[PDB]
Structure 1
Amino acid sequence: AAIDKLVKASHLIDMNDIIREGNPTLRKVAEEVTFPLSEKEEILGEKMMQFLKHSQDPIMAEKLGLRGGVGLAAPQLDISKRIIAVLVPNVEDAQGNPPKEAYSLQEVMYNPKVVSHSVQDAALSDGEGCLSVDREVPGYVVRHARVTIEYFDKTGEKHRLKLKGYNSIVVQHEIDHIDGIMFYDRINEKNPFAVKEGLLILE
């Protein structure tokens, strides 16, 4: 099975492990994981986080042929489980100094869900992309500006977290994957760049 390929100790996730638009697994509702986690589920989380780390590392991205990425969902590896990894880097200043925190968000999340959200909507100015989508897709992907999420870490510890800005967008994108929702589902059908008054456009 896909899971057995991915959890092999020497196996590194690359683009060849990522399923494509059209594959039915991308449209399922992913199954909840049970705690305590199986070895496979724990290893899979670690491999997904390692993928993100590698995708953001100039050397490893080049070695493995990777598109830079800030999130990954298990359904994108053909694994229909509620497991996502998020790695949102902070940026250096104008002087070249690294940020005080390397990341605004770094987590492998099990059974994540949005438990509440703002009335206000938000969208990235530049639209969104997807590891599983090899098409140019224009338009505002309209999401909640702010969310409160619950999820479990690999230990089974429950977390409750409020998110805004890019972090909120990233987590929503990945949670959609585990609900069988694609980013373009949330782009206006008639005018991709339609702006409903009050939309927060993130630069």
Structure 2
Amino acid sequence: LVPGRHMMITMDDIIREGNPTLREVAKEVSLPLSEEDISLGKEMLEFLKNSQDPIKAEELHLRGGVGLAAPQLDISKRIIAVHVPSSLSTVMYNPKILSHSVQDACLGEGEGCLSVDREVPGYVVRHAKITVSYYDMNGEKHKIRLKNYESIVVQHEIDHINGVMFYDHINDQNPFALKEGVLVIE
């Protein structure tokens, strides 16, 4: 009567700051995608969506997030997923930024990260606009231009597959330093 099966990412699966895995440069995924890499991708997206629904997030004790990277699950593979409420909801395999605007931006409230628990003061300067290239679960290759929030989320996730944490962009002694005309989103 009941079809197939799958797993569900639980908060315990998300490793925390200090875990060395978060600092490695994730490995490139092989194509065509394995049924294992496709599943992980799906498990990652289900999570983000789940963490964003009050009832599910609550019943499943999840912390809301809009982006996630395989390394955070302790899987060093270049795979990320983003789910931005109404607009952008996909899994990206071997994502790579091909170009960016000169214009910079940042989240006025500061970026979040399921992997860090401490509160980190400051602004993280990002490219207002970017063009990302990657592969979906089908094997289809995509090239898309993103801006503002979505651009920030993706840049934040790709940093993860390169062993980079958001607070690495924050000048510890001048946390809120910003150049002129930087678009602060909030």
Question: Would you say same fold, with TM above 0.5?
Answer: yes
Partner of 1:173 in structure 2?
Answer: 156
Unaligned runs of 5+ in 1: 1-7, 91-103
TM-score normalized by structure 1?
0.87
Residue identity matched to 2:167 = Y
1:10: how far off? 4.6
**1:30-179 map, 5 Å:** 30-90=26-86, 104-179=87-162
**How far, CA to CA, are the matches of 2:111 and 2:38 in structure 1?**
29
Aligned to 1:21: 17
Alpha-carbon separation, structure 2, partners of 1:185 and 1:154: 31
Within 1, Cα distance between the matches of 2:177 and 2:109?
14
Alignment coverage as a number of residue pairs: 183
Q: Is the 8 A contact 1:75 1:177 kept in 2?
A: yes
Q: For residues 33-89 of structure 1, what are the alpha-carbon distances to aligned partners after superposition, in whole Å with 9 as ceiling and x for unaligned?
A: 111111110100000000011101111101111111101100000000011110000
Match of 1:93 in 2: none
1:9 aligns with 2:14: no
Q: Which runs of 5+ in 2 are unaligned?
A: none
Cα RMSD after superposing both structures = 1.2
- The amino acid across from 2:111 in the alignment is E
- Does the residue aligned with 1:112 lie in a helix, a strand or coil? strand
Moved over 2 A (4+): 8-11
Write the deviation string for residues 67-114 of structure 1: whole angstroms up to 9, x where unpaired. Answer: 111011000000000111100002xxxxxxxxxxxxx21110000011
Identity percentage over the alignment? 71
Mapped partners of 1:162, 1:56: distance in 2: 24
Q: Deviations over 1:112-140 (max 9, x none)?
A: 01110011111001011110101011110
